Amino acid sequence: SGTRWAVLVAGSSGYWNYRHQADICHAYQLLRKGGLKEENIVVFMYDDIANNYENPRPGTIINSPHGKDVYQGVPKDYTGDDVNVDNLFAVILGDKTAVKGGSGKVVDSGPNDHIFIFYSNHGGPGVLGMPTSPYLYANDLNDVLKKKHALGTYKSLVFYLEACESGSIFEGLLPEGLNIYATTASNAEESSWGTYCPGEEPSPPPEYETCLGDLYSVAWMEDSGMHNLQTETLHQQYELVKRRTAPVGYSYGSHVMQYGDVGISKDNLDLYMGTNPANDNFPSRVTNQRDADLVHFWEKYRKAPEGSARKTEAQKQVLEAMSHRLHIDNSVILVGKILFGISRGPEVLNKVRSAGQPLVDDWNCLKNQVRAFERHCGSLSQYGIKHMRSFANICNAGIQMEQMEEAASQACTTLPTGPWSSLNRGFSA
Template sequence: LEACESGSMFQKKLPDNIKIFATTAANSHESSWGTYCPPNDQVNGYSLNTCLGDLYSVNWMEDADRGVASETLTQQFNTVKNETKQSHVEEFGERDMGNDKADSFWGANKAIPDFRALERDLQVPELKTMSSVDSRDIALTTFYSQYLNSGNDLEKRREYARKLMGEIELRQWSDDIFYKIGTQVMKVNNGVPSEALEGHREPTQFECIRSAVNDFKKTCGQISDYALKHVRILVNLCEITNSPQTISNSIHQICSE
């Protein structure tokens, strides 16, 4: 599974006896990463102004492309884990399935050239890591690259500048609004704000969390890709206070200012 906080989908949830073996790009509280991002996003000499893949997924696909018939799921997991240096790749479910041959899950496969050999030829063996970007920052990276590569077209440059500044402002607004909500709720409950702002509590109060997220969307607006990282603050508030009404009151007050 390739996603930020993807480990949270299976941690303490996926049984180990139902014939399912899962691996994730990250643990339960960190971002996954894009790779081959600007300025290393060129195809045939042309910059696409975006990340060409996800670090974990690219490592997995390149390993699969080699078509090593004897490789097991566990061996593949360890290879991808060792090559994904920016996040913690994890495994869940029925570990005994790790002894199964990896290629038995996608059929016969004719090996194609190892792209890592190309990296060695270019003398940049760490290209994927060097060009990786936190998934929460890909939009910012994309708009910045578009702005830099807009050339002498003033109309395009103006449009990309608008998008870049809009992304920066949205990120700043998200940081501020979640900080205010977390701080206010904790003060109302005589708590320490940092416990909500910095912690990573395991979610158990799902009704409270669902209510808080829905209240935020209705009152403050949709949660952007970047702002999704702050949803953990709502989770922390629910786990610490289990007070949906207090959280809702703070959301309505702060987002209505």
């Protein structure tokens, strides 16, 4: 029986993404109460929420309407622009030298140790968002997991994933026999959900003008929080989270997927999460991640005084946000129509591979053509990565980097002016 490790990652920043860093903090407290030690839990958070100007309760973060603070006590291992792909990989691999900035804390695990990774933010097909550019791509993630297993520096590893088109991160990439068990908030085609949002009567927040958490995340955390994790197993939670996330009747919903060695899911939860001495044996879904950003701006504008500057700033926030995503959608479509013609354009871009298949064959092509697109049409931001399947299919169609460079040049011509379109922080790939 080795020691239990953990890696908690929020891939987003901004008060409108309150929920993501709130999830990680909750998860941290959940693990500490279980038995896991602070020195074994590595935390990635941009840390711009607790002391955000918009936070009604400075210095605190909550993950439910009537919840207590979960921000205090969380280590600031990697915060601000230190929250990057390189540091993330370094931590996982347990490389102190590969680290750049931060506390220097890494997963120096052994063969008997258990690892638990939890990510919550934004994402698209084959890509997970980061508060710094470039973003995290599925192939790079799985390669590192493969690179981690080769070291044999862990017995079993669990991966909980919260993002849009989450299944795409492991489908076709994450193989069996690595002793890794991954579950995702959705398949490679459907959406992740914010929960405890303003306007959402299924348990809203009182003065918070932003979502407090995310459904899949909240589901497994609140479940693990109230139970004796020696009685409950991974599989049982997977089923329980599946149900709480699954669609009602004909309403929208998402299939909670599982990948890797399902055999690992026989393990009790305490093998990864520990357990709280309180021994017991064993609601929203109307706002996806991408709209959850906008409900903040809207609620902010809607609740602001009729003549204030606050209402004006919020109005501009709604303006620039919706103007950006309108531009991106048209640009992707336009590039498609430009490359393959009006008929074959949407055909190629919107084609979804069968489940189990990898999103793209050449991941370097994907990155390149994303970079080529952004050089003319501006940054995709964490919204625009929804179109990553379109770029994947363009690559799968055998299109060359120079062709996208040309199509993008014709589609946008000028770089769009806006805080969301800015390339000043780097390319999304």
